[PDB]
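Structure first, sequence second, as always.
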């Protein structure tokens, strides 16, 4: 069962993260980005019980975009790539270079598919196509209502097509719905605009939860400013 595979590979991946170096802080493009990076992590680690830190979607997205696929995939080990492949319902085989190729190949398929779906509208998809679309992108889908599948897929498309959040980081962040209750980071994502709506949509709520999974990955690794 996929659910089975996702629970074990997620839990394993979360273990690996605690000692992974996924980004090189000193190789960040420019000086303004480095200070954003410093501010973000300083803020992250200042959170504590009775001292919850809130992060804007746009605040998180700028940091998230520094964890680029090329660099992240090259930094993942073979066991991490294997677990990541299985989580994405692929059959991993070969050396780490081949695993990277299979994952990249898949992300290209997903890219071509995302364009199609976004142009036609998620509402044009059948129940069965929604289910499959979500599985392929690292999203639950199992036991999930059609409407919720639609909203999940809309969230994925906004973050990928419009916010440009790196897809590998995205997949890794979604493993945090399959643990393994996440280690509390006392941090939370929000959109100022959405917080002023008389009613936030399920989409808006799902968008916050997604950014929260991203924060969860960012709180999982060793302090990037030290390592
Ligand atoms: K925002």
């Amino acid at each position: 069962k996929l659910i089975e595979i996702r629970k074990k590979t997620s839990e394993f991946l979360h273990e690996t993260l605690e000692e992974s170096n996924l980004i090189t802080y000193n190789t960040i493009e420019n000086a303004e980005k480095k200070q954003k990076f410093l501010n973000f992590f300083r803020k992250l680690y200042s959170a504590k019980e009775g001292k919850i830190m809130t992060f804007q979607h746009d605040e998180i997205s700028a940091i998230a975009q520094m964890f680029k696929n090329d660099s992240v995939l090259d930094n993942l080990s073979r066991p991490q790539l294997a677990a990541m492949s299985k989580f994405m319902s692929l059959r991993p085989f070969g050396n780490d270079n081949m695993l990277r190729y299979q994952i990249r190949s898949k992300l290209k398929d997903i890219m071509n598919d995302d364009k199609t779906i976004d142009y036609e509208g998620v509402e044009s998809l059948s129940q069965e196509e929604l289910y499959q679309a979500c599985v392929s992108r690292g999203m639950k889908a199992y036991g999930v209502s059609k409407e919720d599948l639609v909203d999940n897929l809309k969230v994925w498309l906004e973050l990928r097509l419009r916010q440009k959040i790196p897809s590998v980081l995205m997949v890794l962040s979604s493993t945090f719905t399959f643990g393994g209750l996440p280690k509390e980071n006392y941090s939370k994502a929000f959109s100022p605009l959405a917080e002023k709506k008389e009613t936030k949509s399920k989409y808006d709520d799902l968008l916050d939860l997604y950014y929260d999974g991203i924060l969860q990955v960012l709180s999982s690794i060793p302090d990037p400013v030290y390592n």
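Margin note: Residues 1-227 form one domain.
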